[PDB]
């Protein structure tokens, strides 16, 4: 039962006690995500559209 | 003087994101016009109040906050509210339409189209920053742009500003207050890809902050304004080593040294007490054991779970109001030979105690009532995997039958990013279940 | 209408209850699956206690205790009763036991060897079993050589304990024996005690000098079923009740079951379960639990009575199951959910 | 400002959009000439939704009148509320359609449609940000069904992101104007199923049933079963039209209630459904009871005999949300073997302060029940029973049709009934 690094100032104090011792993607890569996803969307407009054409 | 920029996406970033701003401000005394008599340096001053705060020449204190969300609606009572006067319409970023409950359509579709223009305007409070930290990131699982746009902006924070923290405060999904019932879904696909981008996150789980609103506050149907006033004093008690001077986290870095050893379990519980109605007649003010012992009940835990059943990995405590070491310790000493606290074996069994003399402010007219001394502990327990369990569960079983995916593959999300955002969950719940169990 | 499901299929008692429940017309079974349930008999295995108590508007309860399985596991207790002061290492009524690792893997093999030269030299009996969990797998030796070969032969933790060279032989017969007692928790903890224990008897005369043919020395219902050549003999399935038993106590040595023996069970039920109540208690949880648990005892010479284990998924005797599992329904599920005597158990007070 | 765009087609979609306007221009206050004379600023907060606001702050309703003779149109101009509409969006010829889906949907429709889209079109692009479309239609007649389907085919064309939504009286039989209304029913399911959102079936049958039955109404007549219709667009529309958090709009309605694209059919419901004892409270308990009885339902189909994929119920006027929540939960509780498993939480509550008028407080039911699946066994059995003799077949081939198109739709249907049951079970 430690306790250790006491500090104290006026708005308040802090300290710790011891009970016992121990025993990304690129912005290249984010764009791309990005626009592979727009494209599916694109694809996937396009084939209604043709759908609706016929 | 550091600061720190505090980010509020989705419905309920923003609605929390006021609620916190009100805290905030009564707990400076800042005035809703922005204000500050007892801040003597006009126009600037690198106090700890001002890692959340700027300056104006005219002596107004304007929040380091940016508010994001796809639907005007939200965001509208921050332009007309009681604080409309803290922000100027820089900060406040609306769209025409939202996602839908649909994180495809808030990652992808729309986040896409508005992600620049979102990274503008936090460049521009960056750049008022002298020594910026890191960010506060305030969102749902559930919503699409909470889960979908946020995601979205964490991968492109990282990559702007590669050396900064990013703190996370999570709405859990929670049946009684949801009406998405893909909500599941969301969540595990933001998890999946926040995970390597946030250093530390604070999980609420609605369902917590429901029931303690309606057993100790009395509250028979909570609302958003409850429950978010709620949610702002445990946010507000992480926070205030931020705002105040101290040394025990005082900046973003000493949350992850403090809290999180291994970095994917990133998740500290929060534990916060006491909370009494303010329709009460008069309440018998409990002594520092009573609320230490508190913070070690599964009733007033922000997400419910046992830890009694996980291991501890590190444990705060965070005082407010009348407490002093000596009690702090003499509650503790009580509570070990009492209470069942496994730590893991290659950490310490300790506690890092820190304590602020002003007692929680409650916002008037609230619910909270004005209590002497309050706590909030923040433990990284393998007992909040148990969350992550429930949500995977409620995922495969909708999964299995492909129920609602339709609705994600419409928006360009290709079908196989489901299933590898859960087993990127599965996976953490290995890697609890390895740190926890023998 | 309250609800429950079925998640142990292969659950004599709670098949029984099961059937009960039905019985009442007022209870209504759901797919093993369906979280929209007020009671769970859940499976014995990595039961999923963290997705109870998450559903809006259902009081939710299982008859498990997560938790309990540190009192229900060979090595488990062993190492509760070691560790735990309100047990302390000289409980007086657990015998002498050690947790050994197989050397293919703290263990205490030295700590066992040092109790065991003790005795050696001390020309006092040196005699201790073997066995495991992972059992139908027991030896019972005099050598620590042969008990430490065994298990490293193994792959699983076994714990030594000493074997009782000086138990309770019933007459005629001159033969072993031990007590099952049924004991249930409720979710407020209260801790009843099954008025109706089975004495699990041995038809064969106890042989002190030969461990090595174990159907004398083990009092398994199986065991005495399939080696046993005088199964039945004495009495119907080597089960002797209370009624019988405490009335062979009065003609044979002069005292009654509740004096010379009861007191001990009752003393030593109390003392395991509220050693883990802190740990398991779901006083303030968001679900509750009970659960039913079967001692294990031993009864030497002497009338003093030794713990043998304690089982979280107990049998109970065919005689037995109608009482015992209506008792369930009455004080564990009725209690919580309750339906539109001179109770069976006996309440063991004690303070939270 | 999610504005959506009402269009209403033939004799049946004209007289239930006539009375659905009727309904909620009461409940929002704005009179028969579009002047606003409410007492709640909740009824102004979302009348953007359906209304476009005038010079003098005059509400006119955003609904598109489309019908191929004038008849049906004439008595809605000379009607209450028919000086609410904007004349421009009256678009309707003189042929009419025979009750021939051809004629509304290849010849007689098809001279018209164009016109029609200039309308809709003005219409959203005025909007700030359109949400989508709602249709009000029958299936059995020829223009609300063949021309309404041949418009929704078209408004997807030029709006492919915007939610479809329809409101669609099924033929029954029972309530039959024509003996080749399972023809023309058979027909539209399919551009439905292809070209819609989000489809209240709201079969005759269960209306006349409703009325005879339930309402105690000796003979039911179009105007009652219409009255029904009212009611129940009001209700399922409440959440789009007033402040409130859950299937707020379209695509996030669309979102919670169709787990798979072409399962997208809903089985509305209503309560109370009171004879002329009217006076009598109605306790929220009897409120959640009656909701989920299948006598309340306008389907025509027995929920009993599926099971539900998801449901919405919309709770109207001043009650205990707390007492609300409870009863739901016990209709859960009490029969969540109707509820499929793999949808974890698939029925959601919303409430609502302001009631209907003359209603203390009322419940509205919005099911994707797969019990569905009988509605479109009866079409298709009407269908077969005919097409398997060519009965009446001439009406349409005489319009360019071919009989393989109809091989086509009988094909279509009984696919739609087969995907319910892979669910059902
Ligand atoms: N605690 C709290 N939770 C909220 C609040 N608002 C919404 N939620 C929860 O957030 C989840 C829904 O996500 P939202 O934030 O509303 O959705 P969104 O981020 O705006 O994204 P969209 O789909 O575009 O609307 C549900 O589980 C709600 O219970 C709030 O103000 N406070
Ligand atoms: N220390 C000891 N001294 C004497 N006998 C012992 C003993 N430990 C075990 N036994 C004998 O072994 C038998 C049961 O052993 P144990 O209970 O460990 O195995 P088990 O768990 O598979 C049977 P059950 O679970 O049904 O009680 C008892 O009948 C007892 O007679
Ligand atoms: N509920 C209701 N159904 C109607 C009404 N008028 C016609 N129907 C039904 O609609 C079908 C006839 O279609 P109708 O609208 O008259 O043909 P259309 O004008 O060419 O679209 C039949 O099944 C009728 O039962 C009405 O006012 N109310
Ligand atoms: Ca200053
Ligand atoms: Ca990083
Ligand atoms: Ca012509
Ligand atoms: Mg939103
Ligand atoms: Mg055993
Ligand atoms: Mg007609």
């Given at each position: 039962?430690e306790?250790?690094?006491?500090?104290?100032?006026?708005?308040?104090?802090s300290?710790?006690?011891?009970?016992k011792?121990?025993?990304?993607?690129?912005?290249?890569?984010?764009?791309?995500?990005?626009?592979?996803?727009?494209?599916?969307r694109?694809?996937?407009?396009?084939?209604?559209?043709?759908?609706?054409?016929? | 003087?550091?600061?720190?920029?505090?980010?509020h996406?989705?419905q309920?970033?923003?609605?929390?994101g006021?609620?916190?701003?009100?805290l905030?401000?009564?707990?400076?005394?800042?005035q809703?016009?922005?204000?500050m008599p007892?801040?003597?340096?006009?126009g600037?001053?690198?106090?700890?109040?001002?890692?959340?705060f700027?300056?104006?020449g005219?002596?107004?204190?304007?929040?380091?906050?940016?508010?994001?969300?796809?639907?005007?609606?939200?965001?509208?009572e921050?332009?007309?509210?009681?604080?409309?006067?803290?922000?100027?319409?820089?900060?406040?970023?609306?769209?025409?339409?939202?996602?839908?409950?649909?994180?495809?359509?808030?990652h992808?579709?729309?986040?896409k189209?508005?992600?620049?223009?979102?990274?503008?305007r936090?460049?521009?409070?960056?750049?008022?920053?002298?020594?910026?930290?890191?960010?506060l990131?305030?969102?749902?699982?559930?919503?699409?742009?909470?889960?979908?746009?946020?995601?979205?902006?964490?991968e492109?924070?990282?990559?702007?500003?590669?050396?900064?923290?990013?703190?996370?405060?999570?709405?859990?999904?929670?049946?009684?207050?949801?009406?998405?019932?893909?909500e599941?879904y969301?969540?595990?696909?933001?998890?999946?890809?926040?995970?390597?981008?946030?250093?530390?996150?604070?999980?609420?789980?609605?369902?917590?902050?429901?029931?303690?609103?309606?057993?100790?506050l009395?509250?028979?149907?909570?609302?958003?304004?409850?429950?978010?006033?709620?949610?702002?004093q445990?946010?507000?008690?992480?926070?205030?080593?931020?705002?105040?001077?101290?040394?025990?986290?005082?900046?973003?870095?000493?949350?992850?040294?403090?809290?999180?050893?291994?970095?994917?379990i990133?998740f500290?519980?929060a534990?916060?007490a006491?909370?009494?109605?303010?329709?009460?007649?008069?309440?018998?003010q409990?002594?520092?054991?009573?609320?230490?012992?508190?913070?070690?009940?599964?009733?007033?835990?922000?997400?419910?779970?046992?830890?009694?059943?996980?291991?501890?990995?590190?444990?705060?405590?965070?005082?407010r109001?009348?407490?002093?070491?000596?009690?702090?310790?003499?509650?503790?000493?009580?509570?070990?030979?009492?209470?069942?606290?496994?730590?893991?074996?290659?950490?310490?069994?300790?506690?890092?105690?820190?304590?602020?003399?002003?007692?929680?402010?409650?916002?008037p007219?609230?619910?909270?009532?004005?209590?002497?001394?309050?706590?909030?502990?923040?433990?990284?327990?393998?007992?909040?995997?148990?969350?992550?369990?429930?949500?995977?569960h409620?995922?495969?079983?909708?999964?299995?039958?492909?129920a609602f995916?339709?609705?994600?593959?419409?928006?360009?999300?290709?079908?196989?990013?489901?299933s590898?955002?859960?087993?990127?969950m599965?996976?953490?719940?290995?890697?609890?279940?390895?740190?926890?169990?023998? | 209408?309250?609800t429950?499901?079925?998640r142990?299929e292969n659950?004599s008692?709670?098949?029984?209850?099961?059937?009960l429940?039905?019985?009442?017309?007022?209870?209504?079974?759901?797919?093993?699956?369906?979280?929209?349930?007020?009671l769970?008999?859940?499976?014995?295995?990595?039961?999923?206690?963290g997705?109870?108590?998450?559903?809006p508007?259902?009081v939710?309860?299982?008859?498990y205790?997560?938790?309990?399985?540190?009192l229900?596991?060979?090595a488990?207790?062993?190492?509760?009763i070691?560790?735990?002061?309100?047990?302390?290492?000289?409980?007086?009524?657990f015998?002498?036991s050690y947790?050994?690792?197989?050397?293919?893997?703290?263990?205490?093999?030295?700590?066992?060897?040092?109790?065991?030269?003790?005795?050696?030299?001390?020309?006092?009996?040196?005699?201790?079993?073997?066995k495991?969990?992972?059992?139908?797998?027991?030896?019972?030796?005099?050598?620590?050589?042969?008990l430490?070969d065994?298990i490293?032969?193994?792959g699983?933790?076994?714990?030594?304990?000493?074997?009782?060279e000086?138990?309770?032989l019933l007459?005629?017969?001159?033969?072993?024996?031990?007590?099952?007692?049924?004991?249930?928790?409720?979710?407020?903890?209260?801790?009843?005690?099954?008025?109706?224990?089975?004495?699990?008897?041995?038809?064969?005369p106890?042989?002190?000098?030969?461990?090595?043919?174990?159907?004398?020395?083990?009092?398994?219902h199986?065991?005495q079923?399939?080696?046993?050549?005088?199964?039945?003999?004495?009495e119907?399935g080597?089960?002797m009740?209370?009624?019988?038993?405490?009335?062979?106590?009065?003609?044979?040595?002069?005292?009654?079951?509740?004096?010379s023996?009861?007191?001990?069970?009752?003393?030593?039920?109390?003392?395991?379960?509220?050693?883990?109540?802190?740990?398991?208690?779901?006083?303030?949880?968001?679900?509750?639990?009970?659960?039913?648990?079967?001692?294990?005892?031993?009864?030497?010479?002497?009338?003093?009575?030794?713990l043998?284990?304690?089982?979280?998924?107990?049998?109970c005797?065919?005689?037995?199951?109608?009482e015992?599992?209506?008792?369930?329904?009455?004080?564990?599920?009725?209690?919580?959910?309750?339906?539109?005597?001179?109770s069976?158990?006996?309440?063991?007070?004690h303070?939270? | 400002m999610?504005?959506?765009?009402?269009?209403?087609?033939?004799?049946?979609?004209?007289?239930?959009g006539?009375?659905?306007?009727?309904?909620?221009?009461?409940?929002?206050?704005?009179?028969?000439?579009?002047?606003?004379?409410?007492?709640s600023d909740?009824?102004?907060?979302?009348?953007?939704?359906?209304?476009?606001?005038?010079?003098?702050?005059?509400?006119?309703?955003?609904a598109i009148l489309?019908?191929?003779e004038?008849?049906?149109?004439?008595?809605?101009?000379?009607?209450?509320?028919?000086?609410?509409?904007?004349?421009?969006?009256?678009v309707?010829?003189?042929?009419?359609?025979?009750?021939?889906?051809?004629?509304?949907?290849?010849?007689?429709?098809?001279?018209?449609?164009?016109?029609?889209?200039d309308?809709?079109?003005?219409?959203?692009?005025?909007?700030?940000?359109?949400?989508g479309?709602?249709?009000?239609?029958?299936?059995?007649?020829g223009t609300?069904?063949?021309?309404?389907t041949?418009l929704?085919?078209?408004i997807?064309?030029?709006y492919?992101?915007?939610?479809?939504?329809?409101?669609?009286?099924?033929?029954?039989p029972?309530?039959?104007?024509?003996?080749?209304?399972?023809?023309?029913?058979?027909?539209?399911?399919?551009?439905?199923?292809?070209?819609?959102?989000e489809?209240?079936?709201?079969?005759?049958?269960?209306?006349?049933?409703?009325?005879?039955?339930?309402?105690?109404?000796?003979?039911?007549?179009?105007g009652?079963?219409?009255?029904?219709?009212?009611?129940?667009?009001?209700?399922?529309?409440?959440?789009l039209?007033?402040?409130?958090?859950?299937?707020?709009?379209?695509?996030?309605?669309?979102?919670?209630?169709?787990?798979?694209?072409?399962?997208?059919?809903?089985?509305?419901?209503?309560?109370?459904?009171?004879?002329?004892?009217?006076?009598?409270?109605?306790?929220?308990?009897?409120?959640?009871?009656?909701?989920?009885?299948?006598?309340?339902?306008?389907?025509?189909?027995?929920?009993?005999?599926?099971?539900?994929?998801?449901?919405?119920?919309?709770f109207r006027?001043?009650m205990?949300m707390?007492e609300?929540?409870?009863?739901?939960?016990?209709?859960?509780?009490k029969?969540?073997?109707?509820?499929?498993?793999?949808?974890?939480?698939?029925?959601?509550?919303?409430?609502?302060?302001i009631?209907?008028?003359?209603?203390?407080?009322?419940?509205?039911?919005?099911?994707?029940?797969?019990?569905?699946?009988?509605?479109?066994?009866?079409?298709?059995?009407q269908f077969?029973?005919?097409?398997?003799?060519?009965?009446?077949?001439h009406?349409?081939?005489?319009?360019?049709?071919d009989?393989?198109?109809?091989?086509?739709?009988?094909?279509?249907?009984?696919?739609?009934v087969?995907?319910?049951q892979?669910?059902?079970?």
């Amino acid at each position: 039962m430690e306790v250790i690094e006491l500090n104290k100032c006026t708005s308040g104090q802090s300290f710790e006690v011891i009970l016992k011792p121990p025993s990304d993607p690129s912005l290249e890569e984010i764009q791309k995500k990005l626009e592979a996803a727009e494209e599916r969307r694109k694809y996937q407009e396009a084939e209604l559209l043709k759908h609706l054409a016929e | 003087m550091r600061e720190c920029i505090s980010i509020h996406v989705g419905q309920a970033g923003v609605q929390i994101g006021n609620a916190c701003w009100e805290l905030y401000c009564l707990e400076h005394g800042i005035q809703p016009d922005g204000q500050m008599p007892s801040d003597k340096t006009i126009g600037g001053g690198d106090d700890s109040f001002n890692t959340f705060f700027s300056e104006t020449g005219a002596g107004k204190h304007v929040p380091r906050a940016v508010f994001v969300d796809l639907e005007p609606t939200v965001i509208d009572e921050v332009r007309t509210g009681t604080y409309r006067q803290l922000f100027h319409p820089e900060q406040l970023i609306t769209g025409k339409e939202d996602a839908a409950n649909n994180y495809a359509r808030g990652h992808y579709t729309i986040g896409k189209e508005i992600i620049d223009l979102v990274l503008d305007r936090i460049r521009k409070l960056a750049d008022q920053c002298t020594g910026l930290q890191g960010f506060l990131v305030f969102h749902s699982f559930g919503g699409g742009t909470g889960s979908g746009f946020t995601s979205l902006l964490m991968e492109r924070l990282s990559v702007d500003y590669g050396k900064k923290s990013k703190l996370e405060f999570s709405i859990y999904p929670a049946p009684q207050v949801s009406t998405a019932v893909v909500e599941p879904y969301n969540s595990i696909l933001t998890t999946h890809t926040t995970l390597e981008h946030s250093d530390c996150a604070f999980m609420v789980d609605n369902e917590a902050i429901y029931d303690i609103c309606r057993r100790n506050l009395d509250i028979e149907r909570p609302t958003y304004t409850n429950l978010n006033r709620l949610i702002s004093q445990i946010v507000s008690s992480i926070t205030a080593s931020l705002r105040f001077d101290g040394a025990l986290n005082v900046d973003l870095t000493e949350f992850q040294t403090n809290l999180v050893p291994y970095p994917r379990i990133h998740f500290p519980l929060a534990t916060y007490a006491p909370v009494i109605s303010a329709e009460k007649a008069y309440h018998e003010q409990l002594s520092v054991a009573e609320i230490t012992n508190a913070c070690f009940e599964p009733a007033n835990q922000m997400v419910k779970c046992d830890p009694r059943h996980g291991k501890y990995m590190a444990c705060c405590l965070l005082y407010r109001g009348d407490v002093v070491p000596k009690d702090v310790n003499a509650a503790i000493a009580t509570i070990k030979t009492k209470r069942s606290i496994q730590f893991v074996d290659w950490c310490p069994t300790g506690f890092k105690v820190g304590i602020n003399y002003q007692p929680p402010t409650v916002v008037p007219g609230g619910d909270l009532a004005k209590v002497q001394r309050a706590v909030c502990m923040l433990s990284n327990t393998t007992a909040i995997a148990e969350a992550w369990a429930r949500l995977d569960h409620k995922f495969d079983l909708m999964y299995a039958k492909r129920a609602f995916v339709h609705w994600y593959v419409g928006e360009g999300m290709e079908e196989g990013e489901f299933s590898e955002a859960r087993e990127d969950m599965a996976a953490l719940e290995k890697d609890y279940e390895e740190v926890g169990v023998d | 209408m309250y609800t429950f499901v079925v998640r142990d299929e292969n659950s004599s008692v709670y098949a029984e209850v099961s059937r009960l429940l039905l019985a009442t017309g007022q209870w209504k079974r759901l797919r093993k699956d369906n979280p929209r349930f007020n009671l769970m008999l859940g499976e014995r295995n990595r039961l999923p206690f963290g997705r109870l108590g998450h559903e809006p508007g259902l009081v939710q309860l299982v008859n498990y205790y997560r938790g309990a399985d540190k009192l229900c596991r060979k090595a488990s207790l062993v190492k509760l009763i070691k560790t735990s002061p309100e047990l302390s290492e000289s409980c007086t009524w657990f015998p002498e036991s050690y947790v050994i690792y197989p050397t293919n893997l703290t263990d205490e093999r030295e700590v066992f060897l040092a109790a065991y030269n003790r005795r050696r030299e001390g020309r006092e009996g040196n005699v201790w079993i073997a066995k495991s969990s992972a059992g139908a797998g027991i030896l019972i030796s005099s050598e620590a050589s042969e008990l430490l070969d065994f298990i490293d032969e193994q792959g699983q933790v076994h714990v030594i304990q000493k074997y009782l060279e000086k138990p309770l032989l019933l007459e005629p017969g001159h033969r072993k024996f031990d007590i099952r007692s049924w004991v249930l928790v409720d979710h407020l903890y209260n801790i009843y005690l099954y008025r109706e224990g089975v004495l699990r008897t041995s038809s064969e005369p106890y042989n002190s000098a030969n461990f090595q043919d174990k159907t004398c020395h083990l009092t398994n219902h199986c065991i005495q079923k399939e080696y046993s050549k005088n199964y039945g003999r004495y009495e119907e399935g080597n089960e002797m009740f209370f009624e019988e038993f405490n009335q062979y106590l009065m003609d044979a040595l002069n005292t009654t079951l509740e004096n010379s023996i009861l007191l001990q069970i009752k003393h030593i039920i109390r003392s395991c379960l509220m050693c883990i109540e802190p740990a398991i208690s779901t006083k303030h949880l968001h679900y509750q639990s009970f659960q039913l648990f079967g001692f294990d005892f031993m009864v030497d010479e002497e009338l003093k009575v030794w713990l043998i284990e304690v089982n979280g998924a107990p049998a109970c005797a065919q005689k037995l199951y109608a009482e015992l599992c209506q008792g369930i329904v009455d004080v564990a599920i009725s209690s919580v959910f309750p339906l539109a005597p001179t109770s069976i158990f006996i309440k063991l007070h004690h303070h939270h | 400002m999610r504005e959506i765009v009402h269009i209403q087609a033939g004799q049946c979609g004209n007289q239930i959009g006539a009375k659905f306007w009727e309904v909620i221009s009461d409940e929002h206050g704005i009179d028969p000439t579009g002047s606003y004379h409410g007492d709640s600023d909740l009824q102004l907060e979302r009348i953007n939704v359906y209304y476009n606001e005038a010079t003098g702050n005059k509400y006119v309703p955003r609904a598109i009148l489309v019908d191929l003779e004038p008849g049906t149109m004439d008595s809605v101009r000379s009607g209450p509320f028919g000086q609410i509409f904007r004349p421009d969006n009256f678009v309707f010829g003189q042929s009419g359609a025979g009750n021939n889906w051809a004629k509304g949907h290849y010849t007689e429709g098809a001279e018209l449609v164009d016109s029609v889209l200039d309308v809709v079109r003005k219409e959203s692009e005025s909007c700030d940000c359109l949400q989508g479309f709602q249709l009000t239609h029958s299936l059995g007649g020829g223009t609300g069904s063949g021309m309404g389907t041949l418009l929704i085919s078209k408004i997807r064309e030029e709006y492919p992101d915007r939610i479809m939504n329809t409101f669609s009286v099924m033929p029954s039989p029972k309530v039959s104007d024509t003996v080749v209304e399972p023809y023309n029913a058979t027909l539209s399911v399919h551009q439905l199923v292809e070209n819609t959102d989000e489809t209240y079936c709201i079969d005759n049958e269960a209306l006349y049933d409703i009325c005879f039955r339930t309402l105690k109404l000796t003979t039911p007549t179009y105007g009652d079963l219409n009255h029904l219709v009212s009611a129940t667009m009001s209700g399922v529309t409440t959440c789009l039209r007033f402040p409130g958090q859950l299937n707020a709009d379209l695509r996030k309605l669309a979102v919670n209630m169709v787990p798979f694209p072409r399962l997208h059919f809903f089985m509305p419901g209503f309560a109370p459904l009171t004879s002329r004892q009217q006076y009598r409270a109605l306790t929220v308990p009897e409120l959640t009871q009656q909701m989920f009885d299948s006598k309340n339902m306008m389907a025509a189909c027995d929920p009993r005999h599926g099971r539900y994929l998801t449901v919405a119920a919309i709770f109207r006027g001043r009650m205990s949300m707390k007492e609300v929540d409870e009863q739901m939960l016990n209709v859960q509780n009490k029969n969540s073997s109707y509820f499929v498993e793999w949808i974890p939480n698939n029925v959601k509550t919303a409430v609502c302060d302001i009631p209907p008028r003359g209603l203390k407080m009322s419940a509205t039911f919005i099911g994707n029940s797969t019990a569905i699946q009988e509605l479109f066994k009866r079409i298709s059995e009407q269908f077969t029973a005919m097409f398997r003799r060519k009965a009446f077949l001439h009406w349409y081939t005489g319009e360019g049709m071919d009989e393989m198109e109809f091989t086509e739709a009988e094909s279509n249907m009984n696919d739609l009934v087969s995907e319910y049951q892979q669910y059902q079970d």
